[PDB]
């Protein structure tokens, strides 16, 4: 019901409110954000509810509050390769990941849940997705914000994948279960995968190519054998890169 998982992060309300204030103070934003209203919309999603009975509609006021005008042709999805995807967006700073948006920035690496009959936050334990229930506050949030993120994408979407994993593309991950199935074909022309270390011939990548192609979206794939060199030339493309993109 509420156990088997880590509890809500200590000082979670202060943290969410502090993150919103800092995100807005470094992003003169589409529409002024009253961070207090944002925290209230966050709280209203899960407070005083069964933490196994959370729905996506519970989070829609927070989603509406947190809608941002993101350049849709600059979205980098990723699946289970966290550090390189975000360091890539620190350099190619015209491209965004889900954690670079307001809503992703707010909840990144946090846990939360409430209790049915009380207005309190449970800092002791929260429903674990696998062993208690799937419709818990944290999982439902990310399942919701990731769907809307994919729905906003346009013109060419890139996704970074870990080629060292035995399942380079996992159909059961958020990218496979939610994001891929929600790219709008009338807005998205191509999904280009970047496999990080020829693994574009891996059975799981061809599965991603099949799934995407039957939604009438083009598939593209690109091996990256030299990640550190690939990033070095994103910083400064002017030294030695048009001959060194080869199998190391």
């Amino acid at each position: 019901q509420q156990w088997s998982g880590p509890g809500t992060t200590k000082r979670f309300p202060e943290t969410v409110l502090a993150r919103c204030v800092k995100y807005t103070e470094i992003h003169p934003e589409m529409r002024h954000v009253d961070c207090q209203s944002v925290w209230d919309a966050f709280k209203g999603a899960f407070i005083s509810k069964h933490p196994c009975d959370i729905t996506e509609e519970d989070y829609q006021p927070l989603m509406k509050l947190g809608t941002q005008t993101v350049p849709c042709n600059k979205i980098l999805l990723w699946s289970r390769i966290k550090d390189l995807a975000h360091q890539f967006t620190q350099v190619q700073r015209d491209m965004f990941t889900l954690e670079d948006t307001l809503l992703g920035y707010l909840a990144d690496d946090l846990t939360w849940c409430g209790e049915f009959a009380t207005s309190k936050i449970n800092y002791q334990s929260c429903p674990d997705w696998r062993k208690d229930c799937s419709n818990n506050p944290v999982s439902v949030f990310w399942k919701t914000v990731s769907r809307r993120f994919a729905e906003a994408a346009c013109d060419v979407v890139h996704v970074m994948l870990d080629g060292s994993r035995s399942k380079i593309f996992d159909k059961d991950s958020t990218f496979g279960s939610v994001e891929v199935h929600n790219l709008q074909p009338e807005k998205v022309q191509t999904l280009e995968a970047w496999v990080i270390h020829d693994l574009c011939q891996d059975p799981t990548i061809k599965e991603l190519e099949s799934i995407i192609s039957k939604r009438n979206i083009q598939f593209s794939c690109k091996n990256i054998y030299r990640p550190d060199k690939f990033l070095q030339c994103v910083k400064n493309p002017e030294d030695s890169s048009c001959t060194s993109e080869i199998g190391t």
């Epitope: 060419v156 191509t190 083009q218 690109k222 690939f230 030339c233 493309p237 048009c242 001959t243 993109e245």
Partner: antibody
Framework: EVQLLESGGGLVQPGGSLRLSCAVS????????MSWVRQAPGKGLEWVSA????????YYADSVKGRFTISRDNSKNTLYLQMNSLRAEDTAVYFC???????????????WGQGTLVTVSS | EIVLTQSPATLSLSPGERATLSCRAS??????LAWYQQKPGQAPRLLIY???NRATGIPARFSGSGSGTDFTLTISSLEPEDFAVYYC?????????FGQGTKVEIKR
């Protein structure tokens, strides 16, 4: 060093077909998007079509959207432009261009071929 | 599509003079603006990309400035060898578009 060498092209009747080739060397063809840019006689540059490094993703200019097909054979380092239903207004010098960006998207071109003239005439 | 307007159509300068070339986008491309040099009978040569970055091997007399809709190419110490048509090209969205070009002719 990088080299883009276009072949094919010449004289073709209105309504006929022509396939262009672009043989490349000096870079990893697989990991770069390619595009075709054309230049009518005494006119400016007009982007025709773009294709991803692996070939799956393609974009087309509206004027050729139903008649041109971009493609590539990465095992031969060759780019193709399959042109059908050619009209007089397709008469132009056709360049192949290499995307400078390290991924598929709105391109900027750092390497060009020498171009090959296509004449659509009776 | 995004329309790129270059002014003037022709510019006749003397060597050693400063060349100022304009490109005005019909809507904001914000940085995604390249500059290309095309000498007679030749393929274009990328001078500036993303509105301010010199490509490899491009002389320091070529400089790009601008953001949004107003962009400028400057050639500080013009040479007879600089007789070419210069094109601006945007990569803000699809399709990528070029301006009609400015022809720099050298006085003598």
């Amino acid at each position: 060093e990088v080299q883009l060498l276009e072949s094919g092209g010449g004289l073709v009747q209105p309504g006929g077909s022509l396939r262009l080739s672009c043989a490349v060397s000096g870079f990893t063809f697989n990991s770069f998007a390619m595009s075709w840019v054309r230049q009518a006689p005494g006119k400016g540059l007009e982007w025709v079509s773009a294709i991803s490094g692996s070939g799956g993703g393609t974009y087309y200019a509206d004027s050729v959207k139903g008649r041109f097909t971009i493609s590539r054979d990465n095992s031969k380092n060759t780019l193709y432009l399959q042109m059908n239903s050619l009209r007089a207004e397709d008469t132009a010098v056709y360049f192949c261009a290499k995307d400078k960006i390290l991924w598929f998207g709105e391109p900027v071109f750092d390497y060009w071929g020498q171009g090959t003239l296509v004449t659509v005439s009776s | 599509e995004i329309v790129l307007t270059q002014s003037p159509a022709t510019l006749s300068l003397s060597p050693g003079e400063r060349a100022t070339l304009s490109c005005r986008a019909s809507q904001s491309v914000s940085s995604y603006l390249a500059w290309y040099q095309q000498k007679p009978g030749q393929a274009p040569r990328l001078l500036i990309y993303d509105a301010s970055n010199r490509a490899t091997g491009i002389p320091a007399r070529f400089s790009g400035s601008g953001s949004g809709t107003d962009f400028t190419l400057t050639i500080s110490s013009l040479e007879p060898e600089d007789f070419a048509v210069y094109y601006c090209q945007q990569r803000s969205n699809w399709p990528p578009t070029f301006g009609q070009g400015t022809k720099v002719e050298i006085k003598r």
